[PDB]
């Protein structure tokens, strides 16, 4: 132990009259509320609390930003699903003990209600009461969160104003340290209710509400199915030397629900399509399939903001498929054939999915005719596999999905690799396919439809065999997952461990590698 | 999870092993399949019958496998093959012991090299609801039928169509189950526990909240359905299930009408 | 300090319990250091590591662990303390939380370990964090022969620890916890006292290895070894068994039954390569043999190759009556054998010109040679199940496993040089282990190679629970040991516990 560092920030007199809580919502509720005394008598780490300063920070930047309410506490946001209002002070710690080299002051200020949301430069941070505190300081540094209103209580949906404690990185963090690194603060954030806060209207307790943070399913990432081709997953794993900021459409669903792109919910639609098809037969390249693209269930394709129907090969290449077909010929009814359709635009095309229509084409001697009927091709197999967009209208621009972006500076991309079925007549190793999330996390997402905090999870990756954690990621809230690695050659993974969240965490967020 | 029953909504009904090839010219390549894990692991013979998501239907069926070959113009390569699920009363498959002969029509000697492979079902001939053959000629331990019921229910089955080989006929191959995928996950995800024996659920449909009918889950992972009619019901696909409750398993059911 | 009500210890529990026994007043002074309680915090680790996990008992004091093989019961409180090796140059924390006697299990993060009743230490703190291990019950007392749901310390890493560190080592900070009784701990009720009690720590048989006996084939054991060349998980079937005294897959107690079998003579002449008989294999303590978990009857040879058994025949031709014979077996497929243990069946053919008069009974065969002997699994059925022992592992990182090696009697015809069948453990350990039937404490024992007369160390190798040795082995040659020194247990470790490089 040393005190070459600051003893303790303890809290200025910030300029901030008392403020009161449940005195004044009582007589205004019809119930006789209270919660566990033992709740108000320990300091709890917050849902939204972890954050960290490296020296690639600059001043100004955020640390935290959260506001006043029962998302501060663990408990408390337990509690908030069985009651519809809240009132009252909480009281909160700011864990930074940064090592004995760094220097750099954060500045912590109590934001009022119905100011505006954005920038809040630095120059005027320090209008608001604030506490200016170094990130060497040993105790933590207890700050108020009063309950400044302009009502008797607020309800349980965020969609209150109430008072902010936003945190500014005032002066850069910099180390004396003579060798080779820059450590990196890690702060921590801890709360508790203070002496009068309480709920008001016990309700029947939902789970689907704006608390209840991310859960992931307790599935291990080699059981689980592939999102842009129908295989399991063979390995998940980081490689800086592939394009970083890929725009792929399967596969990739916002964090609170929301499909995006050509993303479907069902595992068995992914690299299938549902059509009416015509056969044609040609002396040329034998038949010609037209098909007219419907959805997989059964509903009709209406062009929209979808660059094809929900499923459809996202990817370019030569893709021969399935087809169960009826023939007219007398022997046989029922067969299932194989055609053979392009997906990259090899200097010619035919086929506008976008429009809703393809175009595939077998090769064979006898004028085979076929009962034109309606079906569903499931791939087969890829020759040439191109891992970029195809042409979704014939050379016209497309409703599409971003690109998958954008990193911090060192941030790559964790890749969830599965191997797909090929031809190929002189290459003899495996073609891969990666993806952001697997199928079996959109079709987790698209049932909760979380309530997305500011703009990334933590994750873990456990491993089940030993318990040991293996890394730390960034679930950035669009449904990819950056981890931190300086490395060259390509890192795998063991493919055992679940994931787990951790917390929510800003952009700014910087890993471990 | 009960039987063979897979997480995955990809490892329904195929196999993945260590194949074998030789009887090169007598009818084609005869493949011997030992039997793996689909994620890689050794499959060593416990209480399923079966390696973890092996077809339980009886039939012919065709499978689509990668063929690392050796003859100059090509490299890699997909081919079908023959597969005998059913009984037959003469066939070399025990998938209980971890052996799969399949076979192709071929003339020629196309040699392969004894790679991993991981098949995929492509069509079914002669398809049949029942118990295939698991050992040679010999039982095995599996799942329990699905029952009982109370006087007056009957069993909701959930119906999809496969592709089949079909020399006559041109009607759809249904095939029934009990509870579809995202039902086989989303439980063995979230292990929740029981407190009773069925939970009463109400499917209703998502437009105009009109209630389509009300189902027993029973513990045992299948829904029963109180109906005294004679023929089929069939019933739209664009509601939602919802949990209502815990019931004991004498609840009597509100009846649907045909 | 901490937010929890006292807890009444043997205040509760006295109106119904015989005695209240107090303990020696000089064991409530000393702070002594608890089973598992150490742990080391690199700088490459994540936050929410669990640096330990011990729970509320008399087992985490060497005085209260002996002196509760006497008594009946025990209840109370202890006082704990966590020392922790840092400068003041760290940073870095450590959140010391206390869970109830329930809360089941699975990956606590770190936003959860902080809504227990906990304390947050810093690494670079000097006087030693002392905290109180309460006795949160449902029942009056605890009975001591029976391990039960109480309050556990769990050690969390909360943030991460940042230092420099010059080339090596890395700079860990190490932390140890000590643990003493509060001033009302009590056992219950006098018993005679039991030898077979549950804290009775592995120990290991005063035998040095050359004078064991192999596991695998019947011969003296010639040399232990490391070897980073062969398989490195083998699947053998013989010298399996776990520290807890459960026997794994086809091992034997005694060491006489180690590749042999009794089995029933069916005999029958034929006038093609020679005489052949079929055997239907029994238990060789005369028990009848069902297909059950083993893969084949008990102690039936587990490598493949050219074997051959002796005899048991009774000759009824005139001259001779018994004599002893030499039959052929063959373990691996070779494409053509009928060879089926599981079922209870074997095939043994020997090349005879005439016929011979052999009475059918039950025999029991000894081997004699091996040809062409290949580590590998032999065919316990044709093409078909074995349930079988699973492979030999997992290992961590930079870990070989340490093989007993004997020398197998070789019938060749190319070349001399004697081959090397090995197993994990000796015959000896196998016996000890099934006949001591320990309990196991956490994951892998620490064992310690000495030599009685000089008295220094040879190596410090680790003993799993699953009845194998590894060793953290840096190169690449195949680097054999003494084999005249004794092998002694220290302690408990984790899995994750990284050896000392040998
Ligand atoms: C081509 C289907 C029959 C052949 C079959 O069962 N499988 C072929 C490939 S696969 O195993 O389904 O993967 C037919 C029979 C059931 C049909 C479907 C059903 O009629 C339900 C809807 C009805 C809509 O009018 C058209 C789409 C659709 C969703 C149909 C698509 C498609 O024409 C289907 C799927
Ligand atoms: C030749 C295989 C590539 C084909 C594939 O992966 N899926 C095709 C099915 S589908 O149309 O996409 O639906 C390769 C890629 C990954 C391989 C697998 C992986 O190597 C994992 C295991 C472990 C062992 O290598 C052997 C079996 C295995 C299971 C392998 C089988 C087979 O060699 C696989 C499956
Ligand atoms: C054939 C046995 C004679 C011993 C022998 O042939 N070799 C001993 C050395 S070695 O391993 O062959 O290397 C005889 C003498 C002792 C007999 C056994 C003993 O009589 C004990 C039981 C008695 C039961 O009635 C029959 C089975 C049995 C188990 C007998 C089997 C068999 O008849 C045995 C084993």
Not at chain 1, 19 to 27: E, H, N, R, S
Not at chain 1, 53 to 72: C, H, K, M, V, W
Not at chain 1, 79 to 102: D, I
Not at chain 2, 116 to 133: K, L, N
Request: net charge negative; with cysteine; hydrophobic share 40%.
């Amino acid at each position: 132990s040393g005190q070459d560092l600051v003893p303790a920030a303890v809290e200025q007199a910030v300029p901030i009259q008392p403020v009161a809580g449940a005195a004044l919502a009582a007589p205004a509720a019809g119930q006789i509320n209270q919660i566990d005394p033992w709740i108000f008598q320990n300091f709890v780490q917050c849902p939204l609390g972890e954050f960290s300063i490296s020296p690639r920070n600059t001043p100004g930047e955020i640390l935290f930003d959260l506001a006043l309410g029962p998302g501060l506490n663990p408990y408390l946001a337990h509690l908030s699903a069985m009651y519809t209002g809240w009132v009252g002070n909480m009281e909160v710690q700011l864990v930074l003990a940064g090592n004995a080299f760094t220097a750099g002051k954060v500045v912590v200020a109590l934001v009022p209600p119905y100011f505006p949301k954005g920038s809040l430069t630095t120059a005027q941070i320090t209008c608001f009461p604030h506490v200016m505190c170094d990130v060497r300081t040993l105790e933590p540094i207890q700050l108020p969160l009063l309950d400044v209103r302009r009502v008797l209580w607020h309800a349980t949906q965020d969609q209150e104003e109430s008072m902010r404690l936003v945190c500014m990185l005032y002066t850069p963090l910099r180390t004396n340290s003579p060798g080779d690194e820059s450590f990196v603060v890690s702060g921590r954030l801890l709360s508790k209710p203070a002496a009068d806060f309480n709920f008001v209207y016990l309700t029947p307790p939902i789970e689907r509400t704006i608390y209840r943070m991310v859960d992931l399913p307790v599935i291990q990432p080699r059981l689980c199915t592939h999102a842009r081709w129908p295989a399991p997953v063979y390995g998940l794993l980081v490689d800086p030397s592939l394009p970083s900021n890929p725009q792929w459409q399967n596969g990739r669903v916002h964090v609170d629900g929301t499909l995006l792109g050509t993303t479907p919910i069902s595992g068995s639609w992914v690299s299938c399509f549902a059509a009416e098809a015509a056969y044609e037969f040609q002396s040329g390249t034998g038949e010609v399939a037209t098909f007219t693209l419907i959805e997989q269930d059964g509903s009709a394709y209406v062009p929209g903001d979808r660059a094809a129907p929900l499923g459809y090969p996202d990817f370019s290449g030569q893709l021969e498929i399935e087809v169960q077909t009826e023939t007219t010929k007398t022997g046989d009814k029922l067969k299932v054939t194989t055609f053979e359709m392009i997906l990259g635009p090899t200097t010619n095309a035919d086929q506008a999915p976008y429009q809703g229509r393809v175009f595939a084409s077998v090769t064979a001697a006898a004028s085979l005719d076929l009962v034109d009927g309606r079906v569903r091709a499931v791939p087969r197999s890829i020759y040439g596999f191109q891992d970029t967009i195809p042409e979704y209208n014939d050379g016209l621009l497309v409703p599409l999905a971003p690109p998958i972006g954008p990193f911090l500076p060192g941030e790559v991309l964790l890749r969830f690799r599965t191997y797909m079925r090929q031809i190929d007549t002189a290459d003899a190793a495996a073609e891969a396919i990666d993806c952001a999330l697997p199928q079996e996390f959109v079709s987790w997402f698209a049932s909760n439809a979380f309530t997305v905090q500011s703009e990334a999870l933590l994750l873990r990756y456990r491993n089940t065999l030993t318990g040991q954690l293996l890394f730390e990621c960034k679930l950035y809230n669009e449904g990819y997952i950056a981890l931190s690695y300086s490395g060259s050659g390509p890192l795998t993974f063991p493919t055992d461990g679940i994931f787990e969240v951790v917390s929510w965490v800003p952009r700014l967020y910087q890993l471990a590698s | 999870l009960l039987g063979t029953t897979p997480i995955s909504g990809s490892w329904v009904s195929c196999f993945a092993a260590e194949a074998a090839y030789e009887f090169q010219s007598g009818t084609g390549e005869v493949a011997t399949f030992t039997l793996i894990e689909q994620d890689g692991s050794a499959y060593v013979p416990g209480d399923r019958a079966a390696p973890l998501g092996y077809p339980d239907f009886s039939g012919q069926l065709e499978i689509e496998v990668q063929t690392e070959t050796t003859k100059t113009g090509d490299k890699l390569k997909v081919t079908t093959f023959e597969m005998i699920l059913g009984p037959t009363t003469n066939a070399d498959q025990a998938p209980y012991q971890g052996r799969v002969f399949a076979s192709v029509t071929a003339a020629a000697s196309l040699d392969l090299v004894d790679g991993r492979v991981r098949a995929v079902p492509r069509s079914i001939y002669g398809f049949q609801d029942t118990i295939p053959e698991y050992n040679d000629g010999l039982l095995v331990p599996l799942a329990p039928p699905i029952g009982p019921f109370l006087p007056g229910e009957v069993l909701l089955r959930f119906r999809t169509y496969m592709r089949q080989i079909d020399t006559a006929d041109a009607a759809a191959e249904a095939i029934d189950c009990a509870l579809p995928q995202e039902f086989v996950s989303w439980f063995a995800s979230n292990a929740f526990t029981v407190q009773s024996e069925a939970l009463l659920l109400r499917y209703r449909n998502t437009l105009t909240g009109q209630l389509l009918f009300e189902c027993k889950l029973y513990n045992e992972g299948y829904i029963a359905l109180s109906y005294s009619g004679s023929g089929p019901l069939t019933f739209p696909t664009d509601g939602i299930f919802e949990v209502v409750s815990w019931v004991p398993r004498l609840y009597q059911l509100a009846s649907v009408g045909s």
